[PDB]
Amino acid sequence: ALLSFERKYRVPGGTLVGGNLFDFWVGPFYVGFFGVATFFFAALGIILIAWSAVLQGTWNPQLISVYPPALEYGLGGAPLAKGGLWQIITICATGAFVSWALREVEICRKLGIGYHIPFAFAFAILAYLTLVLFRPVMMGAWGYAFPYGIWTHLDWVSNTGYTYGNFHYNPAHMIAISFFFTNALALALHGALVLSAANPEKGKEMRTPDHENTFFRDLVGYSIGTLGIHRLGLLLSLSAVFFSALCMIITGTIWFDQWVDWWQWWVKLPWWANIPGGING
């Protein structure tokens, strides 16, 4: 089944691998070489997860958890039921995430659009990879990575954060948070404007981009503009994730203590670190 305006788009081409071998769709989904590579990685990864569930002894989605190799194993392999599965599953996730992006690119080529989407996605893959691959490696142990489990990974965040006191003090973390909040704010604002313009008060003609600009200027004295707002939304969310990866990649590699202490560099600045009074005086 196609959208009423789709047929003209389902033409051959755009694939990056295997010419027209996998160039086709299954229902609404496009397959392509990476379509199968994804299904392969996804299934094998899901299979190994269900397997770990078996070895763990439970089918409860709430309880199933796959931990990485204990710190003891450092950066080598480990018994499938004690670090190895997580290791193969991680590869299966990476392969599946990368294959998902590469699949997107082919789709981009077939439709003739820009590659922004898979490019943006890559940041997510890079964030995940930062937690699961890069930080662990720099720290010398897959043990430092998080566990695949609905709650265990939340426990992982809690315990990892509290390892440095209140993680709120990680400056990279703050910037990241600002980006996430600013983003949601931008998203609400953006979605609201387009809608307020497309859906004026009952009975009126659709508002125009001029009304959009006018509304925001009247309100805030500025309008970033349609192109800008999307550029912003993309920049905001991609920056959030980028600073998330950053806030983590440095935690445990170049900064080990309580983050709150980091801020002492500013308080201790030679020209006021000793003035009595205030909070730190």
Binding site: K110, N183, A184, S196, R207, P209, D218, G228, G233, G278
Partner: protein, 301 residues
């Protein structure tokens, strides 16, 4: 290499745009501000004009009053020493009255009074601004979508410093005005309520907070990927679908099996964002009024 439309290649500038008039009282609209070639690389280069009626004046006034009330306290906490003011800027905090004072306004200025005063200004500033987001839309005959979405944010804000503190019986529950202190408060709030990760509404709020970053990255990337067809002209693409809207829709359909419409995607967007503080506001409001420990609560659910 190809150009990914992240920054404009060439900037163009026409005369200052005074915008639409509709039912707007032009007498309350300032003149155009300056043009930023800086901003211009990313979005419009034009600053202003801004509309400032009475509500707007009341809002900026209260807002500044709130800000300054915190500022004077900060300066007081600094001993009026600019050097100390700057080094401990993030450490200063205007805290609310202790539990002893309950929901009374008897707290001595230096011990909850200023905070109460600052909060009153902030209260007025925010609500008057909300009315403004409504009235500015009304003057242009637009939907109140912004006003409504703003409420969702206001909801979390009101719950944190007004609604919940009242329900709890004291201003001491409210959030302090300080960079770090308000962070300490957040952490503390989790600690005192049995870890907020076990709060279902905190988990949701995060799903939507991640989802907003996920969706805007998607939407923004999409639009930019079809801007070569004028996809940014969304209102236009809504009224008269173009290959831009079709290719955007098909990319997602072929990728994840379903898609949106030029107008519908913004509905997904507004809810994704609005749900953030909506669920979150509920999460917080329930904390300490109905649930003292989310871990505990979680055990029976």
């Amino acid at each position: 290499a190809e150009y990914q439309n992240i920054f404009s290649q060439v900037q163009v500038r026409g005369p200052a745009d005074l915008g639409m008039t509709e039912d707007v009282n032009l007498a309350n609209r300032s003149g155009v501000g300056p043009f930023s070639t800086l901003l211009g690389w990313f979005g419009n280069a034009q600053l202003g004009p801004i509309y400032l009626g009475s509500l707007g004046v009341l809002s900026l006034f209260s807002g500044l009053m709130w800000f300054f009330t915190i500022g004077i306290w900060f300066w007081y906490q600094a001993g009026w020493n600019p050097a100390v003011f700057l080094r401990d800027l993030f450490f200063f905090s205007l805290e609310p009255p202790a539990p002893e004072y309950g929901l009374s306004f008897a707290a001595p200025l230096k011990e909850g009074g200023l905070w109460l005063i600052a909060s009153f200004f902030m209260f007025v500033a925010v609500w008057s601004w909300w009315g403004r987001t409504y009235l500015r839309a009304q003057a242009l005959g637009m939907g109140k979508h912004t006003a409504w979405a703003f409420l969702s944010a206001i909801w979390l804000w009101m719950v944190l410093g007004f609604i919940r503190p009242i329900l709890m019986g004291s201003w001491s529950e409210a959030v302090p005005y300080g960079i770090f202190s308000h962070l300490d408060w957040t952490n503390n709030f989790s600690l005192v309520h049995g870890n907020l990760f076990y709060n279902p509404f905190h988990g949701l709020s995060i799903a939507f907070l991640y989802g907003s970053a996920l969706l805007f990255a998607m939407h923004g990337a999409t639009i930019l990927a079809v801007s070569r067809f004028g996809g940014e002209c969304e209102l236009e693409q809504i009224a008269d679908r173009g290959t831009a809207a079709e290719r955007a829709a098909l990319f997602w359909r072929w990728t994840m099996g379903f898609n949106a419409t030029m107008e519908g995607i913004h509905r997904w967007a507004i809810w994704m964002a609005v749900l953030v503080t909506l669920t979150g506001g509920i999460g917080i409001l329930l904390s300490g009024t109905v649930v003292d420990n989310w871990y505990v609560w979680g055990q029976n659910h």
